Amino acid sequence: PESELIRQSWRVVSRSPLEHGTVLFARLFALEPSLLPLFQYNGRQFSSPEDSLSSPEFLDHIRKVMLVIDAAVTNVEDLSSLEEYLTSLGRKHRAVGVRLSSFSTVGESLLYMLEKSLGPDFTPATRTAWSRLYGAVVQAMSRGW
Numbered sequence: 001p002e003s004e005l006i007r008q009s010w011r012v013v014s015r016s017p018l019e020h021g022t023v024l025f026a027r028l029f030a031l032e033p034s035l036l037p038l039f040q041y042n043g044r045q046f047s048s049p050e051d052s053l054s055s056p057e058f059l060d061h062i063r064k065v066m067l068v069i070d071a072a073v074t075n076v077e078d079l080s081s082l083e084e085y086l087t088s089l090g091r092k093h094r095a096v097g098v099r100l101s102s103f104s105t106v107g108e109s110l111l112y113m114l115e116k117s118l119g120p121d122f123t124p125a126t127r128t129a130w131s132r133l134y135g136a137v138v139q140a141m142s143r144g145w
């Protein structure tokens, strides 16, 4: 039942992944501005959250995130088939200054974006399913630490 909730809710999001991931990252930086400095291109720091929105490379980073979530949605019944990628993804993260405790804020910004996108269709069952999927994803990436 849960996998079908995940695939049905994702369907709307995946049609316009940059618009939706823009919402996730805007929210992430409103909640935790101290993450902003981790996204550096040409050795420069964004001053404000809206600076990140004007950067091709940052907008490219978002498309890559939404592609990886999409991979997790396509493989929701068996993530074992994705676990090796995520563990390496995790490693890339720990190496670039990312803290494990930052994962909860990222998950809440994902849930926020899904809830804002889905509206009445974001039933507690959908919230719970996504929170379980995100938790499995974070488990795998935590190995890389």
Ligand code: HEM
Residues within 6 Å of the ligand: 035, 038, 039, 040, 061, 064, 065, 068, 069, 089, 092, 093, 096, 098, 099, 100, 101, 102, 103, 104, 106, 137, 138
């Ligand atoms: C724990 C909170 C997280 C923080 C603070 C964080 C931060 C970062 C940073 C700073 C980068 C490097 C960006 C660049 O140089 O272009 C990155 C890359 C990336 N992140 Fe996250 N991240 C988090 C969690 C996640 C999660 C849960 C996912 C979903 C699986 C994800 C997906 C990705 C992908 C696909 C890349 C690109 C990896 C590559 O280019 O090889 N991140 N992340």
Ligand SMILES: [Xe]
Residues within 6 Å of the ligand: 022, 025, 026, 027, 029, 049, 050, 052, 053
């Ligand atoms: Xe943003």
Ligand SMILES: [Xe]
Residues within 6 Å of the ligand: 064, 067, 068
């Ligand atoms: Xe990717």
Ligand SMILES: [Xe]
Residues within 6 Å of the ligand: 065, 069, 106, 110
């Ligand atoms: Xe995410």
Ligand SMILES: [Xe]
Residues within 6 Å of the ligand: 069, 072, 133, 134, 137
């Ligand atoms: Xe996820």
